[PDB]
Design a protein around this ligand. Structure first.
Ligand SMILES: [Zn+2]
Length: 46
């Protein structure tokens, strides 16, 4: 059992692609545009 932090809080909305944060999610939503692209994927649980 290792005690580390990978995805237990930090950058929930903050852009991870480039690593840019914004005061409000509003402006952030538009920022995602720069990272425009396709990503097909069906429903999968498990
Ligand atoms: Zn970005």
């Amino acid at each position: 059992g290792s005690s580390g932090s990978s995805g237990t809080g930090g950058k929930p909305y903050q852009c991870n692609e480039c690593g840019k944060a914004f005061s409000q999610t509003s402006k952030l939503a538009r920022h995602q545009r720069v990272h425009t692209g396709e990503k097909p994927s069906g429903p999968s649980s498990g």
